[PDB]
DNA sequence: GAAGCTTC
DNA sequence: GAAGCTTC
């Protein structure tokens, strides 16, 4: 997750 | 180094 | 299955 918590996705 | 999970 | 970058 993230920045932050990628994406979800990317 | 490891917990911090949905989108096509 | 790839598709990812980090806070602590």
Request: no cysteine; charged share 0%.
């Amino acid at each position: 997750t993230x920045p932050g918590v990628t994406x979800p996705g990317v």
